[PDB]
Amino acid sequence: QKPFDKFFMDYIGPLPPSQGYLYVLVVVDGMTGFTWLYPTKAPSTSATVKSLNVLTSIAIPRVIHSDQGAAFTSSTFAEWAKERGIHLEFSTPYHPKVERKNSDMKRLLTKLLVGRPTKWYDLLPVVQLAMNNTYSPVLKYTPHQLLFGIDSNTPFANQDTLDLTREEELSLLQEIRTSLY
């Protein structure tokens, strides 16, 4: 299994409106557990296409898994997916623990963002950062080092703090580091 092999995709929201954004598109790499978080104004197909255009600038996934929300089962999205040889796979009642982690993550994510009603847009990058750079007892590593190579030139100076200075950021990093698993 490669990285960028299979994406797990879902929306959280509606959240308190931080700077005209209400939702977050949560994309999770199946192999690495690396999470990309995209703020959106609506859980639309257009918003999803915009977000995934940016993500798929890096690599085109083999499979994208989502529930059967309107944004994902629209024909526009199917067309978008077909155009680039992406196969969409949907949550059904009958086809196959990965979800258990994603559910728990999406729950923490919602708690973190709802709790910062005014600033969550601004701190969204901090949340992704802290999450992808927190250690997993199942992965033996962090999602970041799994994506960017285990022994690789790390883009961080203080692993204690991940180069976060302000107390909003630190209290956030704490909460994630502690509550994640």
Binding positions for Mg ion, rule: CB under 5 A: 10, 67, 69
Q: Are 110 and 82 in contact (CB under 8 A)?
A: no
Contacted by 67, from a second copy, Mg ion, none: CB < 5 to 8 Å by type: Mg ion
Q: Which residues lie below 8 Å from residue 52, measured CB to CB, with a gap of 6+?
A: 27, 64, 80
Site string for a second copy, 130-159 (x = CB under 8 A): --x--------------xxxxxxxxxx---
Q: Which is nearer to a second copy, 59 or 98 (CB)?
A: 59
Task: Select the residue interacting with a second copy from 67, 99, 104, 163 (CB under 8 A).
Answer: 163
Looking at the Cβ atoms of 68 and 180, the one nearer to a second copy is 180
Taking the C-alpha atoms of residue 124 and residue 144, their distance in angstroms, rounded to an integer, is 17
Question: C-beta of 129: minimal distance to a second copy in Å?
Answer: 6
Q: Is 29 annotated as a binding residue?
A: no
Q: How far apart are CA 73 and CA 92, in angstroms?
A: 13
Q: How far is the CB of 94 from a second copy (least distance, A)?
A: 30
Count of residues of this chain found to bind a second copy when the rule CB under 8 A is applied? 37
- CA–CA dist 74, 175 (Å, integer): 37
Tell me if 151 is assigned to a ligand binding site. no
Task: Identify which range of 10-18, 48-56, 69-77, 90-98 contacts a second copy by CB under 8 A.
Answer: 48-56
* Distance of alpha carbon 131 from alpha carbon 133, whole angstroms: 5
Site residues for a second copy, 55-114, by CB under 8 A, read 56-60, 83-85
Element (H, E) at 89: strand 87-90
Residue 12: which of 33, 42, 35 has the closest Cα?
42
